[PDB]
Amino acid sequence: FNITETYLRFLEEDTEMTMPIAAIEALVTLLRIKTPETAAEMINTIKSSTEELIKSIPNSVSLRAGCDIFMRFVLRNLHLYGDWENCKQHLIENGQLFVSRAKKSRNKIAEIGVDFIADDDIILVHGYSRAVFSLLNHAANKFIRFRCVVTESRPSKQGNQLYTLLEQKGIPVTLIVDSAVGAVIDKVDKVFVGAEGVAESGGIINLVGTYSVGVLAHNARKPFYVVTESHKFVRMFPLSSDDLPMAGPPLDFTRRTDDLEDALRGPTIDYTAQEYITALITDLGVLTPSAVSEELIKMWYD
Amino acid sequence: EDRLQAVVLTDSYETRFMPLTAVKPRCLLPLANVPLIEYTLEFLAKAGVHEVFLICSSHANQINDYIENSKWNLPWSPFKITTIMSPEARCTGDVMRDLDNRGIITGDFILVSGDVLTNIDFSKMLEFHKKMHLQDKDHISTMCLSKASTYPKTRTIEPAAFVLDKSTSRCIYYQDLPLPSSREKTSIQIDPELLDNVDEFVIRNDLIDCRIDICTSHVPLIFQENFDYQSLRTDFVKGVISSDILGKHIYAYLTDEYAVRVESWQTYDTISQDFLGRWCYPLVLDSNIQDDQTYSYESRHIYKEKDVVLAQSCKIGKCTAIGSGTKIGEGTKIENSVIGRNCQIGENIRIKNSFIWDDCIIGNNSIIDHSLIASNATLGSNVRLNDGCIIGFNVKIDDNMDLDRNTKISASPQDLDDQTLAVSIVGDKGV
Amino acid sequence: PGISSVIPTVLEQSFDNSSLISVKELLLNKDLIHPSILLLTSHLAHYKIVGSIPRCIAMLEVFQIVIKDYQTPKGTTLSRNLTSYLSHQIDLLKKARPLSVTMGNAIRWLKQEISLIDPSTPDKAAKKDLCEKIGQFAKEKIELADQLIIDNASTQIEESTTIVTYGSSKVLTELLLHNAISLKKNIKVIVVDSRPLFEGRKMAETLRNAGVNVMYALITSLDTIFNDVDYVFLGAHSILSNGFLYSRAGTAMLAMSAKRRNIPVLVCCESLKFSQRVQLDSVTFNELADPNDLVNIDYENPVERRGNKGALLNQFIKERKFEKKKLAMENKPKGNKIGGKKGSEGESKDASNEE
Amino acid sequence: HPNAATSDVNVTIDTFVAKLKRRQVQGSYAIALETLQLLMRFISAARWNHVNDLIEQIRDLGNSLEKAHPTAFSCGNVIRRILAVLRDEVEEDTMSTTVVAEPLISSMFNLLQKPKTDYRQVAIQGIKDLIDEIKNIDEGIQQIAIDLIHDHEILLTPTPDSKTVLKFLITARERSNRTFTVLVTEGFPNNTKNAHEFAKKLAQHNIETLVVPDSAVFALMSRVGKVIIGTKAVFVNGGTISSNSGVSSVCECAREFRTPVFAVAGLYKLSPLYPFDVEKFVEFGGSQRILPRMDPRKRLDTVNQITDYVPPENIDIYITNVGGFNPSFIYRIAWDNYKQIDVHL
């Protein structure tokens, strides 16, 4: 029936259906066909489909995290030894209810996380997450004064994409390069970030230059922010500064070339430690330091 | 106390090294890319020698020319070298009688058989020799000893068991045993003439021989008197103890620090690994004694001289030394191995625990493991070697060659397999 | 009853927070104490191998022996003079060597088990089930938990890697043995050691017996060995409610250097190792030992020299004091491996509330 | 130039070479004294009549001396010191033989503007002044140094090997108005014996002595007032090579705790050479003193180093006979005593 193909169908869609929430909705559809009455036939085939999904993954982390929460909810269903049928109907229904919860959470955060941006504050924003930009838009809806500084992130050129999406709103902007990002931290009140994942330790899984931002801000004593939707938690503990799950290059040094083809190769995803984050924002209240681990301990019961 | 003369026993342990000592002499061979004599001469200079004697007969011309080129023919040297020329191959007793007939021995003289590297200060030794000589008149020679490498379970070539005094440090018995190498004999018989004179008997096999001697003017007179004594340790020491002349004493000196005499190939290998390690605190490559030496210490026990050339993306190991004017290609692993001066090395070559002397070219794609190579010898492509495989002088091993454990190769163009010329007995060739 | 007061060396102007005294050679004692306790106290007084983890395992086994030797009196019941006898054990242990945290959690478990079983059941039926439960407790909380640390570390360590270690922790020895033999990697293991005891030497010896590429080093020679290293493993003793690492001697020095020289610090721990007591510096509560171990010019352990040092009492102020159990700063370590898999050090008391 | 010309006239060249290589000569102070007496013998005995041929010969002799022993910086500096004293008096002499020469100050910029006598006597007296300078450094230190340390302050000390520092500490303890507690790191593989003699001489004078193991340095750093270094050689960038073991970590420990770092040295101890790499400059020790038995030493590849290096990022003051200077200024003190050409001999 396929799950990778269902995820590939979301091309011109996105924005509303968040990348993990669309993968979770795809997991529920695959579950509801071949009877969730059996726990040997279904769960094993769900595990095989997640393994097939991980094997097809090039540079995504959040899809593995979202699977875990689904699994957890499924197991928790019939924890009351309830009827093998009303528990099943509640499990199938919690697929569309899971996607509907992404809207309700965004409604919560955009009213909570506008408080952090005070009267007339210049912001240097890095990365693009649907939660951080929704704060930025619904603060403009709240009629609050804020300036914006764009970071030239280099994955699939994200800075230019961010700049254009800020133009459509009506907020004054200018391009700042990630090389010169050190020379900006004096005319900037606060530094904001959108994460691809949040660590078990309390650190962050992010883009092509975020640790560098974290350290410079720690030097300048200027605050460093992480805002996300509460589903990007993996049981992952990157022990060192340069160790992450990869399908491509972990720093490759190429031979002598004349035509100039083999060059680009650098760490596209980088980790930053727990100390560098001043504040973290999700729908699960306002919490930062040891909070992430407590969430993971509560979920995994281990 | 001043004015000290020394005699060096060379042409003594030849052919004990089986494939070598064919064209060039015993002591010319380098330990750490530098001749064995140079170590001994440095020990002489640190001791305080004013006059040096050397015993050369076989390949004597090459020895004399090397002394001509040496740092001691020059007037500023504290000692002057005079060579003794004798008939070809004779025992130590025969040379002792020759020197007594010539008559140059004055007071206390020095005799060393074989070449020994030690960090032990000799000034303490001389004082304790003199203090014990003042104790009683009829006192003869001094012997050096050091504490053994853990237990001598791997040491079979030196099975010398010493019986010593706790109070006076006088030797009583000398005995050799095969034991773990050849399980045949068990018994050791001791003379009971010396029981109550000593009382505090201490029997030890856990001591390494040195064969370094401080000797009185009595010694050459005794050698001429008793011309039956050929050796200096096995028969001579035992003969002195067992009431030859009544009331005569010989010393045995205990030292905690490193002192090992070179004799065999696998002993030579251990001493070399000890030198690469920091076992001999003064005797290290970086200090540079031969003056032409420009070695520099690097962390993790890696030695490099000046003008060391190496190809990028190459891994070096632990306890390694590389000479001057040396080139190395890509994909090379050098682990616990010595490579000489002016040695060109090809590509994709894995070396572990091996040995290479000066001016040696190695062919591409070859693995060498715990095996020795002599000077001006070339290795071909696709060469695989095993443990204890010693390769002689000027030996040209051609492309595609495999040799098993302990496959010794002759240095002269007789009885053992593989010779010097192209394709060495892999298809009948050789003079 | 025992020997108390009268101590060797000066009272000392700086650092006087803990007891510096005790019985090494047996003179005047009660004739009721079980000899396995007397053996362990004589062991721990001059011990070279143990470091936190094995000390409790031995303490458990000694307790198992006592219960096996225990026969209930006809007049007095099981919970009558047992708890007094155990209090005599701890007091004798305290005199010999200050207890670990894991030892305290064991005693607390045992005292809970005494209250759980009422004096009504037959005596031989009681102790037979008790030792079975202790064995299962030792299985779960040590052996099986240790194996869980092993596999957690296995995923964490990269292929062909250099590791610098310290101490004589049971968990780390088995860790490295698992790396060398069962997994078969290129692991360069460098071991460091201090002066009071040769913990690292013993670990290196055991690693040599396995056949590992081992460098052996000292604290003085650190700024040369680093300039190579990828991971640093520390032998845990106790992590507090703060998140501070209360461990052995040359630990924090290493931790500091590592943090400054980019490469992280890792700590393997047990769920029994955590405590609810709190401190922030090394001065707070220290495991002090007699300068008698530091008199000799080291090399091995017994050499007996006519050296330079000798007098401590008669000398006009010459405090040759050393500590054993020190503190690492909180931010510096990064990973902790336990019964609940993983968790950073800033999350310390997520085990104490989970129980 | 070789020693073929100087053999019968000068013999003491080769005895100093022998003293370096086998390490019969010990301590930078002693190495300097010997090289002074060498140059004393070189001028008193030789016949030259020409000046430029003489100076370049001295340069070659110094070049060979530093190649003979790399850790003898005090050897290299003393020659370089006399070389510059010579060069100034020659440049003064050439101005009189030809016949504004005084712009403002004594600067640099040698890339801008272009250009029988008692010269030998000046060379003689120049050696004599160097000796007297090396003889008396402590008097010049005590007037700057014993102004910075307070009552009830605890002093931690790596490298107890220096004769200079111990004598600085004893002059401060002589002042009855000054009280301080002394912590001493042991420095196990080398300094041990010297550290124990250090602790003995402090008790002899009745100063609160505290012997510290090299592990316990961290366990005290919260309580430490100041850190003092017994350096062997000081450099251009500021950094020091010290007399062996357990300094670098202590300095790293101090900087993290923001505890001040002091250094006691001489200008002859100060070097105009630059430490581009520690790898070349630091001398390594003998592993024999660590671990016995050679059959396990096949597998026990132990690492030990004598000399320890400190980067300039840690230390703040270099109190000499002249005065106290910051590491970001010490280069000028060096160039005031040694010329730019007198580096690459």
UniProtKB/Swiss-Prot annotation, chain A:
Main location: cytoplasm
One GO molecular-function entry: translation initiation factor activity
Family matches, as Gene3D superfamilies: Translation initiation factor eif-2b, domain 2, Translation initiation factor eIF-2B, N-terminal domain
Pfam families linked to this entry: IF-2B
Top-rank lineage group of the source organism: Eukaryota
Subcellular location field: Cytoplasm, Cytosol
Phosphothreonine modified-residue sites: T288
Disrupted gene: phenotype observed: Inhibits GCN4 derepression in glucose, amino acid, or purine-starved cells.
Sorted UniProt keywords: Acetylation, Activator, Cytoplasm, Initiation factor, Phosphoprotein, Protein biosynthesis, Repressor, Translation regulation
GO CC annotation: cytosol; eukaryotic translation initiation factor 2B complex; guanyl-nucleotide exchange factor complex
One Gene Ontology term from the biological process aspect of the record: cytoplasmic translational initiation
Additional facts recorded: Present with 8970 molecules/cell in log phase SD medium.
Family: Belongs to the eIF-2B alpha/beta/delta subunits family.
Summary of the function given for this chain in its UniProt record: Acts as a component of the translation initiation factor 2B (eIF2B) complex, which catalyzes the exchange of GDP for GTP on the eukaryotic initiation factor 2 (eIF2) complex gamma subunit. Its guanine nucleotide exchange factor activity is repressed when bound to eIF2 complex phosphorylated on the alpha subunit, thereby limiting the amount of methionyl-initiator methionine tRNA available to the ribosome and consequently global translation is repressed.
Protein name: Translation initiation factor eIF2B subunit alpha
Organism: Saccharomyces cerevisiae (strain ATCC 204508 / S288c) (Baker's yeast)
Curated annotation (Swiss-Prot), chain B:
Record keywords: Cytoplasm, Initiation factor, Phosphoprotein, Protein biosynthesis, Translation regulation
Principal location listed in the UniProt entry: cytoplasm
Intracellular or extracellular location(s): Cytoplasm, Cytosol
Gene Ontology cellular component terms for the protein in this record: cytoplasm; cytosol; eukaryotic translation initiation factor 2B complex; guanyl-nucleotide exchange factor complex
Example GO molecular function: translation initiation factor activity
Domain of life: Eukaryota
Gene Ontology terms: biological process: cytoplasmic translational initiation; regulation of translational initiation
Function summary: Acts as a catalytic component of the translation initiation factor 2B (eIF2B) complex, which catalyzes the exchange of GDP for GTP on eukaryotic initiation factor 2 (eIF2) and is regulated by phosphorylated eIF2. Its guanine nucleotide exchange factor activity is repressed when bound to eIF2 complex phosphorylated on the alpha subunit, thereby limiting the amount of methionyl-initiator methionine tRNA available to the ribosome and consequently global translation is repressed.
Other facts: Present with 33800 molecules/cell in log phase SD medium.
Family assignment from sequence similarity: Belongs to the eIF-2B gamma/epsilon subunits family.
Annotated protein name in UniProt: Translation initiation factor eIF2B subunit epsilon
Organism whose genome encodes this protein: Saccharomyces cerevisiae (strain ATCC 204508 / S288c) (Baker's yeast)
Chain's gene name: GCD6
Portion of the full-length sequence here: 24 to 472 of 712
Swiss-Prot record, chain C:
Principal location listed in the UniProt entry: cytoplasm
One Gene Ontology biological process: regulation of translational initiation
Region (Disordered): 328-355
Coiled-coil segments: none
Localization terms from the record: Cytoplasm, Cytosol
Transmembrane segments: none
Note: Present with 10300 molecules/cell in log phase SD medium.
Entry protein name: Translation initiation factor eIF2B subunit delta
Encoding gene, per UniProt annotation: GCD2
Curated annotation (Swiss-Prot), chain D:
Signal peptide region: none
Record key words, sorted: Cytoplasm, Initiation factor, Protein biosynthesis, Translation regulation
Keyword Protein biosynthesis included in the entry's annotation: yes
GO cellular component terms attached to this protein's record: cytosol; eukaryotic translation initiation factor 2B complex; guanyl-nucleotide exchange factor complex; mitochondrion
GO BP, sorted A to Z: cytoplasmic translational initiation; regulation of translational initiation; translational initiation
Keyword Cytoplasm: yes
A Pfam short name: IF-2B
Further details from the record: Present with 6650 molecules/cell in log phase SD medium.
Protein family: Belongs to the eIF-2B alpha/beta/delta subunits family.
Function as written in the Swiss-Prot or TrEMBL entry: Acts as a component of the translation initiation factor 2B (eIF2B) complex, which catalyzes the exchange of GDP for GTP on the eukaryotic initiation factor 2 (eIF2) complex gamma subunit. Its guanine nucleotide exchange factor activity is repressed when bound to eIF2 complex phosphorylated on the alpha subunit, thereby limiting the amount of methionyl-initiator methionine tRNA available to the ribosome and consequently global translation is repressed.
Name of the protein in question: Translation initiation factor eIF2B subunit beta
